[PDB]
């Protein structure tokens, strides 16, 4: 996913990883030592928050999924960057 959507609910981990609520601690905190995610866990609502990310390999749908959400950062920023160039070029000269 593009997220964020960073913090995750325990029921989602209890769905995908199909683990009980009492064992989610050992699960996600062990990944903290492995190094795939550094995200601390929010234990009030029992929601597991994520930080950084671990990339692995790639797929043909990942490149197509890239061009969708990667170049989208290129077309959105440069579009409004021209607005910074347009209006503010007069005060510079």
């Amino acid at each position: 996913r593009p997220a964020n959507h960073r913090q995750l609910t325990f029921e989602e981990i209890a769905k995908s990883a199909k683990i009980t609520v009492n064992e989610v601690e050992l699960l996600v905190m062990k990944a903290l030592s492995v190094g795939l995610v550094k995200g601390s866990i929010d234990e009030v609502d029992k929601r597991v928050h994520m930080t950084w990310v671990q990339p692995r390999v790639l797929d043909l749908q990942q490149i197509k999924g890239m061009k969708d959400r990667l170049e989208f950062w290129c077309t959105d920023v440069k579009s409004m960057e021209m607005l910074v160039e347009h209006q503010a070029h007069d005060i510079l000269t």
């Binding site: 593009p2 997220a3 964020n4 959507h5 960073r6 950084w52 990310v53 671990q54 990339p55 390999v57 790639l58 043909l60 990942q62 490149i63 890239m66 061009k67 959400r69 990667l70 170049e71 989208f72 950062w73 290129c74 920023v77 440069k78 960057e81 910074v84 160039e85 503010a88 510079l92």
Partner: protein
């Protein structure tokens, strides 16, 4: 070993002035010479050098010769005037590297443990901080090839020195310096989107080309890995700033407040004092 190099405009010109030397007589190839490095630390620096007659045949694409009588005795020349200056490697103007460049470095390793080659550019064009640098190592390969000798890119940066900016920085004379704080940072911003997002489009089109053709490079894996480090924030629709929304304007909190507070009293300094000194001269004269 060699991490980064420092290329002075003086030694880079020693490649450029030799482009006038053999450029008028021609014919093929490029300008090639041996590089004199100054190594005080892991960071590499270059002060002077000496250009040597060199040619590389096409046919015969693997043929190259340095003149080593030029390399030996002229070393004792620069060594006699400068004891610190020694040969750290070689250079050339490229623009790219033919496969024959593997044999130029391995021959001169008798002079230096690792010879760093510097690809330069006599005509500035694109895309940015010019020239280039390579280091000679052996990574073999994962596929099982026989030991592969491939030059890895070394980041190049320009640097200055005392007494060398006398004539160099004089001749331009047309530059406005800078001005730091107003135009200096904002022109970069207009370019930071340009130069930032153009390589974004150039690579994303070549990364799409991967599936099409040119595979390998797979790469692997360096491409997507640091791209996913870029993915700490995407930022995609819409900006996912719900936590950074109130913090967005909260960083602009005091910046606007002070700008409101300074312009109020700066006016009180500008407006009052101007009116005072003006009417003192204006009405008392007539």
């Amino acid at each position: 070993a060699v991490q980064k190099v420092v290329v002075h405009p003086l030694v880079l010109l020693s490649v450029v002035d030799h482009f006038n030397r053999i450029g008028k007589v021609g014919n093929q190839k490029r300008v090639v010479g041996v590089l004199l490095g100054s190594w005080q630390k892991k960071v590499l620096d270059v002060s002077n050098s000496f250009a040597v007659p060199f040619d590389e045949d096409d046919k015969d694409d693997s043929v190259w010769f340095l003149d080593h009588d030029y390399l030996e005795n002229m070393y004792g020349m620069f060594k006699k005037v400068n004891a610190r200056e020694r040969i750290v490697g070689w250079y050339h103007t490229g623009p790219k590297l033919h496969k024959n460049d593997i044999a130029i470095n391995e021959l001169m390793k008798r002079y230096c443990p690792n010879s760093v080659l510097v690809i330069i550019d006599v005509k500035p064009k694109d895309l940015g901080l010019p020239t280039e640098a390579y280091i000679s190592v052996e990574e073999v390969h994962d596929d099982g090839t026989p030991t592969s000798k491939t030059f890895e890119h070394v980041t190049s940066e320009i640097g200055a020195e005392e007494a060398e900016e006398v004539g160099v920085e004089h001749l331009l004379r047309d530059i406005k310096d800078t001005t730091v704080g107003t135009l200096s940072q904002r022109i970069t911003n207009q370019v930071h989107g340009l130069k930032g997002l153009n390589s974004k489009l150039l690579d994303i089109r070549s990364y799409l080309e991967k599936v099409a053709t040119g595979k390998l490079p797979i790469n692997h894996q360096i491409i997507y890995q640091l791209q996913d480090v870029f993915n700490l924030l995407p930022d995609v629709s819409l900006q996912e700033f719900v936590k950074a929304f109130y913090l967005k304007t909260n960083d602009q909190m005091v910046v606007v407040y002070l700008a409101s507070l300074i312009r109020s009293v700066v006016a009180l300094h500008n407006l009052i004092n101007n009116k005072i000194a003006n009417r003192d001269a204006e009405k008392k004269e007539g």
